[PDB]
Every structure is written in C-alpha cells, then in structure tokens.
Amino acid sequence: YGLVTLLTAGGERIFSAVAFQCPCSAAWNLPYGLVFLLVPALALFLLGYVLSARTWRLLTGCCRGSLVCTQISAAAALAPLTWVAVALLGGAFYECAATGSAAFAQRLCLGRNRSCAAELPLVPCNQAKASDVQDLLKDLKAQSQVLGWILIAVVIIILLIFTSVTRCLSPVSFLQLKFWKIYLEQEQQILKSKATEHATELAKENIKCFFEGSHPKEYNTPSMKEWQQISSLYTFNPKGQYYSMLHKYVNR
Amino acid sequence: YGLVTLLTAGGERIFSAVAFQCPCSAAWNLPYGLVFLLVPALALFLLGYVLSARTWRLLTGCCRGSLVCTQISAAAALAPLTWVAVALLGGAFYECAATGSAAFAQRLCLGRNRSCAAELPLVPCNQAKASDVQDLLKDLKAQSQVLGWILIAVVIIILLIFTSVTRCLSPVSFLQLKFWKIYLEQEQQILKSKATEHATELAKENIKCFFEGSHPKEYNTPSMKEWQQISSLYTFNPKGQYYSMLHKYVNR
Amino acid sequence: YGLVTLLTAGGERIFSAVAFQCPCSAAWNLPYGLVFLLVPALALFLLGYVLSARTWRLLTGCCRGSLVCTQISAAAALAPLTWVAVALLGGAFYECAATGSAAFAQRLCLGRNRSCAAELPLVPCNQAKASDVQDLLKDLKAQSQVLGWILIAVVIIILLIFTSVTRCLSPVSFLQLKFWKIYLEQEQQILKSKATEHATELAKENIKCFFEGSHPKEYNTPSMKEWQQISSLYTFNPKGQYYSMLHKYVNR
Amino acid sequence: YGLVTLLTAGGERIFSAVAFQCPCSAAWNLPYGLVFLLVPALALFLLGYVLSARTWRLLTGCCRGSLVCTQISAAAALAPLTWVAVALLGGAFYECAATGSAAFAQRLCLGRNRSCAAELPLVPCNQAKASDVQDLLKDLKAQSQVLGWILIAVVIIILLIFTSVTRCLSPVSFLQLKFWKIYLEQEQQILKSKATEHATELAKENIKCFFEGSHPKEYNTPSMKEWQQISSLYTFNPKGQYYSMLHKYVNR
Amino acid sequence: YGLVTLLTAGGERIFSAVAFQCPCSAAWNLPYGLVFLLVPALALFLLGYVLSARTWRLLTGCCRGSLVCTQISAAAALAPLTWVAVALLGGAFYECAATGSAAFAQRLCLGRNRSCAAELPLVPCNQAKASDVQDLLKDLKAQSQVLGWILIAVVIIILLIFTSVTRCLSPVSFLQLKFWKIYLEQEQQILKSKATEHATELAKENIKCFFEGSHPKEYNTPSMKEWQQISSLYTFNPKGQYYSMLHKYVNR
Amino acid sequence: YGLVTLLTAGGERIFSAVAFQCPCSAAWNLPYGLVFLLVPALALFLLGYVLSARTWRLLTGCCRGSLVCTQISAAAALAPLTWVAVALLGGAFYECAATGSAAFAQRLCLGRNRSCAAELPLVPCNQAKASDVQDLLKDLKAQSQVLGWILIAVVIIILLIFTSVTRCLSPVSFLQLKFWKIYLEQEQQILKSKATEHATELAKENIKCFFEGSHPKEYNTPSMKEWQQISSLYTFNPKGQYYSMLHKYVNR
Amino acid sequence: YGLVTLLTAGGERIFSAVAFQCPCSAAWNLPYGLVFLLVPALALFLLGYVLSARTWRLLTGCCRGSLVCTQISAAAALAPLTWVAVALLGGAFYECAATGSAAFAQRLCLGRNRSCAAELPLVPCNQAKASDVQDLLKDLKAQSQVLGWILIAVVIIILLIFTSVTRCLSPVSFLQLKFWKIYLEQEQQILKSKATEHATELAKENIKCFFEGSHPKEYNTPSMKEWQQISSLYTFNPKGQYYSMLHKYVNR
Amino acid sequence: YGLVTLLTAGGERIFSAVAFQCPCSAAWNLPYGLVFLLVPALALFLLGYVLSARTWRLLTGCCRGSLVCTQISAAAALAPLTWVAVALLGGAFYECAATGSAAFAQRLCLGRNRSCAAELPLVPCNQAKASDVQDLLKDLKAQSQVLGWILIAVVIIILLIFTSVTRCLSPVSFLQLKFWKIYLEQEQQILKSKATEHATELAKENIKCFFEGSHPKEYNTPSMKEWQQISSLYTFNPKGQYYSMLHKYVNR
C-alpha cells in the first residue's frame, strides 16, 4: 500500500505544481507559453527517436541513407505532433501565446480601444476590463482550437499518404507481406529464447570451471564478425528472397 | 493502478479541453464550427478507408476498377456519416454554423430587428439581448436536429438499397453464400495458424544452422510469384466455382 | 475499464444531445415533431425488414408472392408500431405536433382568446401566458396519451387475429407443428456445425497442397445448382410430407 | 454493462413518460381515465388468451365446445381482473373517471355549490378552490378504493367456487388425480426430449445424404394423420382409463 | 437484474397506492374502513380454506361430517384472525370505523360539544378543531389497540384449548403418535418418488410404442376404483391398527 | 430477495403500528396499559406451556400429580416473568398504569395542586402544565423501574432455590446424573433415526404391494398397547435403576 | 437475516428502555439508584454461584465444609465486584445515590445555601439553580469515581493474596501441579467421549430389543452406588497420590 | 454478530463512563487525580507480578533470595512504569493533581492575583477567569508532559543498564546462551506434548478399568517427590553444565 499512497501523493503534487497560470507579463509571457508547447513535444520526439530498435541497428558501429532515416524519423515523429495537437486543443497554451511578438498584437486587435499593445497581455489574465479585449480572448481561443484541429487533420492525412505509398511501390504482394511479418516476429522470439539458454549454458560451464579451477570445454565460438555481418538492415533483393538477413546468411 | 489513474486524468483533461464554447465572432466563427463538423468526420473516414483489409489487397503492387472501389469506399464511409449525424444531433455545432456566409443570415432572420447581420453571431453566445434573435437561436437548434435526423434516415435507406441490390443480382443463392462465408473465415484462421507454425520451423532451422555455423536443410521454397498470384481479388466465375482464389489455384 | 468509461461518456453525451426542447416556432415546429415520431420508427422498421433471414431466402437470385411478403412485413413491422406507441405515450412529440397545419389549430382551440393560431405554438414552450392555451396544452397531452394507448391496443389485437388465423387454417395439427419446429431448429444447428467442419477440411487440404505445391485430392464437389435448389421457400405439400425442402430433396 | 445501463435508462424514460397527470378537461377526460383502466386490462387478457397451450390444441385445424372454452377463458381471465383491481386500488384512474357522463356528476355532488357540473373536472386537478368539491375528491378516492377491494374479493370468491366445483364433480378421486398430473408432466418432458433427439437423427441422416449426394435410408415415417389423431383434447372415458390421448392411442 | 428492478418498482407502486387516507366522509367512510378490515381477512381465510390438502381429499367425488369440517376450518381460520388482529393493532382501520352507524357516535362522544354527530367523521381527518373530538380520536385509538390485543389473546386461548382437547381424547399415546406422523411423512415422500418414476416408465413405453407404431407391452393396470378406495379419510379403528388407509388396504 | 424485502417492510409496518402513545384518557387508559402488560405475558406463558414435550407425555390419553405439574409450569413460566420484567423496565407501560383505580391517584399525588384526580391522566400525555404532576411523572417512572428490577431479582432468586432443592433431594449423585442426561439425549436421537428408517421400510413394502396389487409380507407388529406402556413419565425406583422407562421395559 | 434484524431491534429497544434518568425525587430516588447498583450485581453473583460445576458436586445428595465453600464463593464472587466497580465508575448510579438518608445530605453539603436538604435531590436532575449544589454534583461524581477505583484495587489485591496463599501452602510443587491439571482436563474429555458412546451402545441395544420385542443382552451394569462413590470432592492424601478420586478408586 | 455488537456497545459504554472530568473541588480533587494515576498502575503491576511463570516456581511449596526476587519484580515492573508514563503524557491526570497539598499551590503560583490557593482548583475546570491562573494551567500541562518524558527516559535507561550488566557478568558466552534458550524452549514444548499424551493414556486405562470394573495395569509411577525435585530454580554450576535442572537430574 506504500507504493500506492506515495504514487497518488506524488501525482497530486506533480499536477498541482504543473498548474498553468499563464502569467500576464508584457514580455516574459511569450516564451512561457512557447516552452509549454514545444519542450514536451521535443521530449516525446526524442523518446520516440530513442525507443525504436530499428534506428539503433543502423546507428551502431561508427555511424540511400536518406530513405531509412526519414522513414524512422516519421514513424517516431507520429506522437509529438499528437502532443502538440492535444495541447493546442487545450487552448490555454496558444491563448498564452497571444502576445508573442508585437507584430501579432498590432495585426491582431481590431484597433477599437487603440490601447491594445500596451496591456493586451492581461487578456488571458482576466485583469484588463476593456470590452474589446475581453471579446478578443474568445477569438484567440477559437484560433487555437481551429489550428489544432487542422493540424490533427494534416497529420492523419500525411500518415495515410506515407503508409499508402509505402504499401504501393513494394515489389512483394500483401498476403505474402503478412506472412513475412509473422515470420520475423517468430524469429525474434525464437532468437531471444535460444540465445538466452545458450548464454545460460555458456555461463554455467565457465563458472563451474572457475569454481573447480580447471580448463574449460571449448565447445564452440560465436564469431563477432559474424554477429556484425548479420546486423545488416535492408533485407531485400528480387532474386535471393532470403528474408531477415540472418536467414540470408545461410548460403555461405 | 497507475494506468487507471493516468487514463482517468488524461480523459478528464482531454474532455475539459475539448470544451466547446462556440466563440461568438463576426467572421472567425463559421470555420470554428465547420471544422468541428467535418474534420473528425474526415478522420474517421480515413481510418475506415485504412482499416479494412479488402482495399490493401487491391492497392499493393504498383497500384471494372470502379465497382470494387465504390463498394469499399461505401463500406468504410458508413461510419463518418454516423459521426456527422450524431454531431448535428448534438446541436451545438450547427448552432455555431448559424452565421456562415452573410447570405445565410440575411435569408435567415425574419427581418424584425433590422439589425440581424451586424451582431447576430452573438446569438449562441447568449450575449445579445434583442428578443428576435433570442427566439431565432431556438429555430436554429430545430433546423440542426431535423437535418441530422433526415441525414441519419437517408444513410440507413442508402445502406438498405445498397446491400439489397448487392444481395439481389449475385448469381449464387443464399444458403450457399452463408456456407461460403463460413468457408472463407475458416480458411483465414487455418492460414494464420499453419503459416505461423511453418515460419516458426523455418526460423528455428535457419537460426540453429547459424548458431552452429553450417549448411541449411533446403526443405522447400514458397514462391514469391506464387504468393502474388494468390493475392487476386475477384474470386468468381460461373464455370470454375473455386472460391477463394487460393483455392482456385490448385488446378495448375 | 477504458471501454466502460468511454461508453458511459458517450451515452451521456448522446442523451444530453438528444435533449428534446420542442422549439416553439410558427412554421418550423411541425416537421420537428413529425420527424422525431416517424424517422426512428422508419429506422426500426427497416432494421426489422433487414434482420430476419426469412426474407433474404426469397430475395436473392435476381429477385402467391403476396402472402409471404405480407407475412414477413408484418412480422418485422411488429416493433416500429411499438416505438411509435411508446413515443406517443411519451407525450412530448405529439404535444409538439400540436401546431401542424393551421387546420388543426383552428379546429383545436375553443375560440376563447380569439388569438389562438397567431402564437399557439408557444403552448408547449410555456412562454404564452393566456389562460386558454395554458389549459389547452393539457388537453393535447391527453389526446396524445389516449391515441398512443389506442394504437398499442390495435396492434396487439391485430397480432392476435393474424397469429390465430395463421394457426387456424394450417393443415397440420399442433402437437406435430411443435415437433416440426424443433426439427428445423436442430437441422439448422447441425447444418451450421457440419458445414463448418467440412469447409474446414476443404481449406486444410487445399492450403496444404498449396504450401507443398502439388495436386489436390479431388474428394467431392458440392454442386452450386444443388445449393440453389435447396434454397426453396414453401416447404409443404399434402402428399410428400418432406419438411424443410433440403429434406424434401432426398428422393432424387 | 451496456444492457444494464440501457435497460435502466429505458425504464426511467418509460415510467417518466407514463406519468399520469389526469388532465382536467370538461369532456376529453373521461376516455383518458377509461383507456388507462380498460386497455392494459384488455392487453393482459389477450396475452393470457394467447399464452396457454391448452387453447391452441383446440383451435388449430380449421377451428360441448362451451365448457372447454369457458374454462380456458376463465383460467386466462384470472389476471386482467387482478390488473384492474390493482389499478382501481391505485385510485388515480377512477378519480380521473369522476366526470364521466354528466349523469354521474349531477347524481354525485351534494348540490352545495350549485356549480358542480360546470367545472367539477378540475377536482382531481386541484385547480378548483370551492370547498365542496375539494371535499368531494376525497369521497371519490374512497369509492375507488372500496370498489377495487370489492372486486378483488369477488374474483377470489369466483375462483374458489369454480375450482371447487371443478374438483367436486370429477369422477376420479384426488390421490389418483395428483399422480395423473405428475404422469402428464413426465410425458411432456419425455416427449420433448425424445422427439428432439429423433428429429436430430433425421436431420443428421438427411443432411449427410445431401452432402454426399446419394439415396437416403428410409428408416420410418411419422404419419401426419397419426399426429393429428393424437392431438385430441378430452382425454377421458369411464371404461378406457387411458389418460393422455396419445396413451389412449395404443390399442389400435 | 430486470426481475429485481421490476419487483422493487412494483412493490413501491403497490404500497404507495394502498396508501390509507381514511377519507373523512359523513356516510361513505364506515364501509371504507370495514372493507379494509374484513375483505383481506376473508381473502386469507379463503386461501387457507383452499391450500390444505386435507379438505380436498374429503371434497372430491360428488361431495360425522361435522367434526372433520370444523377441524379443517379452524386449522385454516388460524391466520385470518391474525390478520384482523394485526390490522386492528394498526389502529388506522378501526379509527376509521369510528363513525359507523350513528348509534356508535351518539353513544360514543361525551356530549360536550353537543355537535358530535354532525361532523365527527372529521376526527381522524384532523380537520375538525373542536377540542372534545381532538381528544376523542385518542380514546378511539385506545379502544382499537385494546380490542386487537384482546382478540389476539382469545385466539391463542382457543388454539390452546382446541389442540389440548384434540391431544387429550385420542386413544393412541404420544410417543406412538410422533412415530405415526413420521411414518405418514415418509409414506408421502416415497409415494411421490415411486409414483413419479412409474408414470415415467409408463410414458416412456407408450411413447416409444407410438414412435415405432406397434403394440404396447400391457405390463399392469392401476385400478381407478382402487385409487378411489385408498383415498379414504378417517384412518383409525381400535382393532385394525393399519395407519394410513392405503396401508389398511393390504388385507384384501 | 423478495422474502427479505417483504420481511423488512412487514417489520417496519408492525413496529410503526405497535407505536405506544399511552392515550391520556380519564377512564379508558388503565386497561390500555394493563393489557400491554399482561396479554403478551399471558401469550408467552401459553406458548411455553405448549412447547415443552414434557407436558404432552402426561396430558395425552384421557388426561403425586401436583409435583410434576408445578415443575413443568415453573419451567415454562420462566419466560413470561422475563417479558413482564423487561416491559416494566421499559417504563412506558406502568407510567400508563398511573391512573388505574382512583385509589391509586388519591394515595399517589402529594396533594399539592388539590386537582390531581380530575386530570392527572394527562401526566404521561405531557398536556397538563401543573408543576406538581410534571414532577410526579418522574416519580412514577422511578416506581416502575424499581418494581421491575425487584421482580427480575425475585425471579432469579426463585429459580435458584427451585433448581437447588431439586438438585439437593434427588437420590442419584451428580456425576451419574450428567451421564444419565447424556444417555437420554442419545436415546432420543437413536429413536428418531431408527423409527424413521423402520417407518420408511414399512411404507416402502406396503406401497410396493399396493402398486403390484398383492399380499403384504407381515414382517412384525409394533403393539399399540406396548407404545402406550412405554410412554410412562416417572422413570425412577431405587431398586430397578432402569432409566428411561422404555429401557425399564426390557425385563418383561 | 431475520435473527439479525430482530436482535438489533431488540437490543435497541432494551437499551433505550434501560435509559437511566435518575428521577429527582425527595424520597423515592435513593432506592432507585440503590437497586441499579445492587440488583444486577446480585444477579451476576447468583449466576456465578450457579454456573461452576465445582459446587454442584458438593451440593447434590441431600446437601472442613467452610474452606471449600468460601473458595467457591470467592471464585464466583470475582465478577459481581467487577460489575459494581464498572457501575460505580459510570458515576450515574452513585450520583443518584447522593440523597440517600438525610444524614448523608446534612453531612454532605458545605452548608452554604442553608437550603440543601430541602431540594438537594434536584442536583443530578439539573433543575436546581443554586450555585452551591451545582458545584456539589461535581464533588459527588468525584467521590463516585474514586470509590470505584479504590474498590477495583481492593478486589485485585484480595485476588492476589487469595491465589498466592492457595499456591503457597499446597504440598505438591508447581511443575507437577500443571501436569495434574492437564491430566484432569484430559480425563474429563475422555470421560465425556467414552460415556457418550457407551450410552449410545446401551440405547441402541435396548431400543433394538424393543423394536423386535425380545430379551436384552445383559452386558454389564454401571453401579449407581459406585457412581456416587466416585463423585467425592477432596482428591488428596499425602500417601496415596491417586489424583481425581475416580482414579483413586481403582485399588478396590 | 451478537458478540461483535455487544462488545462494541460495551466498549462505548465503558469509555463514555471513564470520561474524565477532573472535578474542580477544593479538597476532594487531589485524590481523584492520584487514584487515576496510581491505581491502574498498581493493577498492571500486580498482573505482571502474577502472569510470569518464573515466580510461581519459586513461590509454591510453603514459600540469595534477593537477586531472583528483584529480577522478577523488575521484569514485571517494566509495564506499570509505561502506563504511568503514558498517563502523565496524557496531561489530564497531573493537571488534575495541580491542587494537591496546599504547599504545591503556595509554591506554585507566581503570587500575582494573591488569591491563588482559595480557588485555584478551578484552573483545569476553566471556570476561574483570573488571567494569572488561566496562564498557569498551561505551565502545569508543561510540567506534566516534561516529567512524563523524563520518566520514560529513566525507565529505558534503567532497562539498558539492568540487561547489560545481566549480560556482562554471566559466565557463559553469547552464542551458547542463544542455543541454551532455544533448548529450554524446545524442552518446554516437548514436555507439554508428551506429558499430555501420557496423562491421556493414564486416564484412558484407568477409566476403562472403571467402566469394566476390574484391576488396573500398574504400568509405572511418576514420583511426586521427584516432581518437586525437578522444580528447582537456579540451573547453573560451572562444573556440571547440565542446563534445565530436569536435565541436571539424570545422573542419579
């Protein structure tokens, strides 16, 4: 129960602290909103760029290269656009971005009060009492929500076009592509299991020879150059079907 | 419990943020309502256009074609019309679409206050106090609900006519069509299972030959051209009953 | 828990949105009530006309015919009358239908205020304050509930007469009719099961021959013309008892 | 959980809609109460007249007959009298029936206000403020409850006399009648089970002969005329004890 | 859950409708209270007169007779006196019976206000404000509770005397009477079971002979006159101990 | 759940109806309290006089006798004194018995107001406002509680003396008396079981001979005079230890 | 659930009725408090004097004797002192005993108001408003609590001294006394079990001989004089260790 | 559930009755606080002096002796100091002990009001309104809490020094002392079990010889003098290791 109580207390503290006031300030407010827009987005973008095992396979070993890189970058950049869309639909952040550069303000307000740019930043702060800006906050909320929805539409459209073209120009057919993906899944699980038990037997034998203090068995040697050889990425050629480069490396 | 608490917090944030104020604005309001009508509808339309495995079979491989395309498009377009109907029945969105182009306003209001078009947009905003428009918001709600119900009737009617004609002109009878669909279902499940275990044995053999470092078995080769050959779509001819083109491809 | 929470949220949104205000309008109100009466009724009528497997058997195959058609139409039209009865007993819809054509209003009001037809539509809206119409709304509620109950009586009476005559003029007796229906039920379940397993073996054999790449077995052929032949509908003749036309088709 | 939530919502809607206001109207009120008394009673009467399997046995086959018909009609009419008794004990319905024909009103009120018949119908409506009728509503409630209880007494008395005479004049004794009813119960269950499995074997054999496409077995024929012969109703004669006419039909 | 919800709704409706107002009326009130006293009592009396299997044994077969009849009538009349006692202890009913015939009123009130009989019936109605009757309602409540308790004492006394005399004059002793009752209980259960299985075998044999269409077995015949012979009631004679007349009928 | 809900409703009705107001009346109040004291006490006394199987053994068979009768009467009269003690400790009943005969009142009140006997009965009714009686109600509550506790002491004392003397003058010792009571308990249970199964076999044999219609077995006869002989009560004599007269009746 | 509901209702009634008001009365109050102190104490004292099986062994059989009698009386009188201590610590009872004889009052009050003895009894009643006695109630509460605690100390001290001396002068040592008590416990349980089964076999044999009606077995006779002989109490002599007089009676 | 409900009711009564008012009295207050300090402490001290089995071994048998006596007294006096410390930390008791002898008061108050000793006792009673004593109650609370904490420190210090010296001067080492304590624990449990079963066999044999009435077996005799011999206390000598004097008594 200790973990549960500490976690609820931590969550409450975290959220009460991330309370978003949108400080009404003449010049320090724009970055305040901008970081709450971009920085968590950049964070999730980086974590996506990290998590996928597809990129590490290419990166390791002392670092055509465009296609794979843009593919992985988009497959990871899926999510940060979702965060920025959800946030922009939250309305608070962009409403806080109202001030921005003075150009936004001068172009923004209808020019009714003739005193916009001076203390417009008070408009999400609710402290200004001029009727014009009290109506302008609403229009800013509108622009925020609309821009957010337009972005979440553009992202889904781009995902469609990307995956459709990637499914259109491949040489292999569909009903074979499904079987191929099932194959690679099974290969990964089998590799995990059997490599696990083989490392287990290696460790057992060597550690027993150490406890006794005698010569080892010398059963076999997994070649390191062979390991690097099977880490290749592309895994396709029209002639040598040979999926999963490991499987391709059984002819020699 | 962490997932549960985070999900409820996320849901509450999401819904409190998608709070729909319908900002009363002279010109920026129309698109505000229009995107909340169309964009989620377009989103669900695209996801439907994506999800069904029937279309990918046709699309892959470097892209009469009308019939299958309109069939799949309608079978996927079922749902977006449901979203737009539910939303239009919500009333808020179309009520927000009241303003639109000025033509809607000039034709819309009874001309009582003679000051409609100037600040009609305040009518869902509840800020205008002229009696005429305070009554006009109600009529707009009515037009919204009625249009929504008419649309949800037209969509069900169209679905009826579509599925009835598609069931009317087919050469095969009913009690055989049911058995045929059961057959294709069983074939899909059997294919999944046996292809899974065959890929499993392939991976096991090849990965063992790799761990040992010796020649593979060369059991058999699933031909890629054969795979593409069995991905065909139509699966009917009056003479060669041969359902499920895979099954049709057993004569040669 | 995600499904549960999303479903309760969706239900609350759906019902709060289907909130029925009965907009008080001089001319746009009548259709508002009329669609909420008829359209869901038409919807349930269509779904009934769709769901029953009895009609598809007749319809498929390029489309005395009166009797079966009216039987199926009534057996499906059972429910829409129930919806319209429940709704009319709800009172709100017909109360909203008060205005209708002006003929209803002129014949309706007792002529006390002499100003009925002008702004009677306000009477379910509760905005009119003339005593005469404030009493007239009550009488309209009465007419609604009474008409609803009369309809729900007429529908049960018609169902009685229909099923009684259909049970009266049949040649077969009762205690045999029960056994016959049990027989057809068992036949349907047996057909489902055995056709399932036979399609399973067909798919298994053909898919194995495909994986290997060799000739199939050629066990037997379910004739398509035979399938259509056994899809017949009537299933009765005084001489050849032969229930369930499939069973009738065992003599030749 | 979906069914549970939808059912509670439906029940709440149904009951809130069947809210009984007893509209105070000069002439349209009497039928309003009368239908809520009679129509659900007629409904339950019809469902009783339908549900019992005893009547269908007599009715089917192209339609002394008095005794069985009055027996079944009373055995089914048990319940509608219970509904009308419960409703009359509810008090609202008969209180609404106060107005009725003017004869009821003129005979009803004590003649104190001398203005009864004009706007007596307001008396359950609570809108009239004359002391005489405000006391008269109470007496009407009394007459309702008393009449209801008298009816629920008369119905139980009639049930007593009916079942007692039916138990008095039968030739067979009691301790044998109990065993006879147990016998018929067991016979019904055995018939259900064995007819079920026999229809199952019939369907299995015929459907296998169809799948193969060969001649059937011709095991035996349940004669339809025999089926009608065993559907007889009376099942008694002093000489040939032979309960359950099916059992009577074993001599020839 | 449907049954549970419908039952609680029905119970609430039933009890809210059986709400007992005791309408204050000059002449229609007395029967109002009297029926709520007697009619449910008569109902439970009749159900008791029905339920016991002891009376049917005597009644069937075309209808000393005093003793058995008064015994069964008292054994069933136990409960209605309990209902009337509980109700009279409820106080509301007899308080409503205050008015009754005018003789009760004239003898009842102390004659203080000299205006009792005119509008005494208002006294449980709480509408009369004369101090004398406002005190008289209390005395009436007292008379009700006291009479109820005296009745519930008289009924228990009568039950004592009845069962004691019935236990006093019997020829058999106690420790044998207990064993005799255990015997009859076991005999009833054995008869139920074995008659059940024998009717089961009868039905099975006859229904099989019907399905096949051949002659029955003719195993044995339970004689109907024998059945009536064993339905006798008295079951005692000093010489032929022979409990349970069925058992008495084993000598011939 | 039906039983649970009906029972709670019945209990609430029962207790709300047994609400004890102690009607303040000049002459009808004394019996009101007196019956609520004595009648339930008499009821529980009678049920005790009934329940014990010890008395029936003596009573049956056409009805020194003092000792057994007073023993059983006291062993059953234990409880009614407990009821009257609990009630008297309740205080309400005796407080209601304040008035009683006028002698109690004249001796009771201190004579301060000189107007006691006229309307003293109002003193538990709280309607009288003279200070003297408002203090006198408290003293009456005191007399009630004290008398109750004195009675509950006298009853326990009497129980002590009774059981002690009954344990003092018996000839048998203690450690043998315990074993004797265990013996009689075991004998009762064994008799129940074996008599049950013997009656079961009797019924089985006779009912089988009836179903077949043949002569019975004539196994043995439990003599009725023997049954009465073993129903004797005293079960002691210094010479023939022979507990449990049944056991005493094994010598001849 | 019936027992649970009835028990909670009974408990609530019991405790609400044992509500302790301490009636302020000039002379009837002292016994009111005194009985609530002594009588339940006497009750628990008597139940203790009854429950212990040690005293009955001495008492039965037509009634040095000081030591055993005072031992058992103290071992049972443990609890009543606990009740009186808890009650005296309750404070209400002794506070009610304030008045007592007039000597307590005259010695009690400081003599400030000079009007103590007249209406001091009002002091726990809170009705007197003289400051002196309003302070005197507090001192009386103090005297009550202090006396209670002194008594609960004296009782524990006496228990200590009693059990210590009883453990000091016994001839046997400790580690043997523990084993002896374990022995007597085991002997009691063994006696219960084996006497139970022996009485069971006795009853079985005799009741079978009765059912058959033949001579008994005459296995053996437990001598009654022997039973009394083994009921002796003291169970000690320095020479013949022979615990548990039953065990002592194995030499002859 | 009865035990649970009675226990919660008893606990509530007990605690509501032990409510501590600290009666403000000039002279009767000091003992009031002093008994609530000392008497429960003395009680727990006595129960500790009783419970430990170590002291009884020394005490029994007609009563260097200093060391064991002070050891057991301290090991039992652990707890009463804890009670008095907790109570003194409660603050109420010592605050009530404020008055005490007049010397405490005269030395206590700062002499500001010059009227301390007269009615200082009102200071925990909150009835005195002089500012000086209203501040003095706080200082008294302080002195109470501080003294309590100093006492709970002194007791832990004394326990440390006691157990450390007792662990310092013993001849045996630690790792052997632990094993010795484990040994004595196992010996106690083994003795309990085997003595139990041996007493069981003794009782069984003797009670069987009694039931039969014949001579016993005379298996063996546990000598009473031997029992006392093995009850010795010290259990140590440097030469004869022989833990657990019972074990020491195996040489002769």
UniProtKB/Swiss-Prot annotation, chains A, B, C, D, E, F, G, H:
The lineage of its organism: Eukaryota, Metazoa, Chordata, Craniata, Vertebrata. Residues 50-72, 163-252 are cytoplasmic. GO terms for cellular component: immunological synapse; plasma membrane. Placenta. GO terms for molecular function: monoatomic cation channel activity; voltage-gated channel activity. It is a multi-pass membrane protein. The gene is CALHM6. N-glycosylated. This is Calcium homeostasis modulator protein 6. The chain crosses the membrane at residues 3-18, 28-49, 73-97, 140-162.
